[PDB]
């Protein structure tokens, strides 16, 4: 009976009050479809927030913080009701409790609030959460507490519109530099996912991540035994190599490409796909980065995935092939030709994905444009592949660019 | 893409 719980939670008899707040916590924690709206509409929120002030009773504030944590774990509606009740300043104050459980429950609640969205985390950031949060990182912290802190850190880096403020990224990067040397798998997964969110926010953030010194410790995680670590690390370095040529070179200079044989042959197709996506952002670089892909012996496997991979991997591989014809020399492209790129590249011309068909027609045109001395022979390869029929029936395609360069290629090179 | 955003504290 919730009206009675709310009344009792007000009581000046401590036993009555603690019992009521515990009954609310139990209603919010016993399964994972708690009656959050019922408790909110009861009026219990200001009483719990008041209980957060009871520094004389660490058990009372722990129970209230737990109840509020679980209300804040609901819909954005329910999280914002907690925020509207002024809980955030009281939680920030609890970060300085001498009582580790109380601190931890305050961290947990703030993590739920921060995770609701970017204006919400900006409010929590403006009130100074980051420094006390990061001050918890220590060899003496219980590991389950450290995992809660790192989850909150991921939550602080998760929204990119807008991304967290520059000053916050500057504060969080040294903590991630510390945690990337941790052995616990959960810590590492959180740390690297936080890095993947930070590197997805543009080239200035990528430069900050590079400037922190963390990349030489991120790249070796591409070969971690835990596939969740590998997945996150591959996302993060992939984001970095979407940057400039010099930012890409930083990653390459960490021995990145030596990790890719195992990613390109990985049993998990999502790994193969992200790996080829990464590689495609390398073959879009200068001739030396193209050559680095060639000398790492990755091209036969890229072509194999272009041939036999899942559709997503095939799309990334078509991009890696087409990209190589940007700053690649004629001999690098000729090496592609000697690796029998043409049949599995032409078989993509039938896919209904107009973007893929475009990219493949692009690459074919570029390679034909610069292979003069035996362009005719390459035409044979396109012809005897069955690819010339693909182009001569893409003649009747819907997309303007598609049939445009289909007619163009069939005119000049056939 | 598995990294939690919101976490109910259940009694362990």
Nearest to B5 by CA among A303, A245, A80, A75: A75
| Minimum distance, in Å, between the CA of residue A73 and any CA atom of chain B | 5
B interface mutation test: which of A36, A105, A110, A112 has the most B CBs within 10 A? A112
Q: Give phi and psi for A405, each to the nearest 5.
A: -75, -15
The DSSP result for A62-87, as a single string, is HHHHHHHHHHHTS-HHHHHHHHHTTH
A29 contacts B9? CB cut-off 8 A: yes
B5 contacts A155? CB cut-off 8 A: yes
Query: In angstroms, rounded to a whole number, what is the distance separating the alpha carbons of residues A82 and A249?
Result: 46
**Domains held by chain A: number:** 1
Technique that determined the structure: X-ray
Q: Which of A66, A111, A190 sits opposite B3 (nearest CB)?
A: A190
What are the C-alpha distances in Å from A254 to residues A59, A164, A178?
50, 28, 19
Task: Please say whether the beta carbons of A221 and A188 come within 8 A.
Answer: yes
Query: In angstroms, rounded to a whole number, what is the distance separating the alpha carbons of residues A349 and A153?
Result: 44
- Flag whether residue A30 sits within 8 Å of chain B, measured between CB atoms: yes
The helix/strand/coil state of A26 is: helix
Q: Which of A30, A31, A151 sits opposite B4 (nearest CB)?
A: A151
Nearest to A154 by CA among A126, A191, A122, A128: A191
Task: Please say whether the beta carbons of A282 and A324 come within 8 A.
Answer: no
In sequence order, the 6+-apart residues with CB closer than 8 A to the CB of A390 are: A346, A347, A349, A350
Domain with A201, as residue range(s), is: 1-414
In sequence order, the 6+-apart residues with CB closer than 8 A to the CB of A38 are: A2
Cα–Cα–Cα angle for A311, A312, A315, nearest 5°? 85
Task: Please say whether the beta carbons of A103 and A94 come within 8 A.
Answer: yes
Query: In angstroms, rounded to a whole number, what is the distance separating the alpha carbons of residues A66 and A87?
Result: 12
Q: Give phi and psi for A98, each to the nearest 5.
A: -75, -5
Which chain A residues are closer than 8 Å to B3 by Cβ? 154, 189-190, 193, 232
Q: What is the rounded (10 degree) CA torsion for A211, A260, A193, A119? A: 70
Which residue has 């609310």 as its token pair? A24
B8 contacts A154? CB cut-off 8 A: no
B9 contacts A108? CB cut-off 8 A: yes
Resolution for the entry shown, Å? 2.1
């Amino acid at each position: 009976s919730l009206e009675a719980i709310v009344q009792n939670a007000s009581s000046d008899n401590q036993g009555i009050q603690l019992s009521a707040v515990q009954a609310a916590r139990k209603l919010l924690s016993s399964d994972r479809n708690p009656p959050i709206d019922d408790l909110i509409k009861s009026g219990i929120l200001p009483i719990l927030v008041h209980c957060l002030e009871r520094d004389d009773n660490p058990s009372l504030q722990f129970e209230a913080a737990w109840a509020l944590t679980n209300i804040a774990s609901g819909t954005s509606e329910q999280t914002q009701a907690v925020v509207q009740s002024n809980a955030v300043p009281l939680f920030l104050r609890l970060l300085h409790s001498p009582h580790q459980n109380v601190c931890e429950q305050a961290v947990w609640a703030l993590g739920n609030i921060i995770g609701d969205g970017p204006q919400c985390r900006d409010y929590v950031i403006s009130l100074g959460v980051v420094k006390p949060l990061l001050s918890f990182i220590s060899p003496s912290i219980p590991i389950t507490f450290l995992r809660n802190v790192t989850w909150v850190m991921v939550n602080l880096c998760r929204h990119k519109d807008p991304p967290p403020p520059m000053e916050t990224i500057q504060e969080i990067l040294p903590a991630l530099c510390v945690l990337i040397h941790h052995t616990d798998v959960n810590i590492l997964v959180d740390t690297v996912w936080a890095l993947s969110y930070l590197t997805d926010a543009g080239n200035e953030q990528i430069q900050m991540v590079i400037d922190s010194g963390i990349v030489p410790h991120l790249v070796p995680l591409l070969s971690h035994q835990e596939v969740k670590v590998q997945t996150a690390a591959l996302r993060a370095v992939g984001n970095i190599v979407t940057g400039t040529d010099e930012q890409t070179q930083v990653v390459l200079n960490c021995d990145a490409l030596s990790h890719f044989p195992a990613l390109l042959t990985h049993p998990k197709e999502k790994i193969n796909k992200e790996a080829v996506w990464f590689l495609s952002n390398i073959t879009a670089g200068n001739q030396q980065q193209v050559q680095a892909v060639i000398d790492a012996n990755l091209v036969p496997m890229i072509i194999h995935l272009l041939d036999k991979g899942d559709f997503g991997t095939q799309k990334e591989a078509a991009w890696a092939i087409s990209n190589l014809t940007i700053s690649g020399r004629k001999d690098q492209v000729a090496y592609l030709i000697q690796q029998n790129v043409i049949p599995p590249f032409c078989n993509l011309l039938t896919v209904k994905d107009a973007q893929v068909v475009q990219v493949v027609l692009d690459g074919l045109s570029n390679i034909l444009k610069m292979a003069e001395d035996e362009a005719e022979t390459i035409g044979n390869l396109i012809e005897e592949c069955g690819g010339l029929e693909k182009i001569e029936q893409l003649q009747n395609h819907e997309n303007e660019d598609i049939y445009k360069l289909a007619y163009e290629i069939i005119d000049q090179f056939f | 893409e598995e990294v939690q955003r919101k976490r109910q504290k259940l009694m362990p």
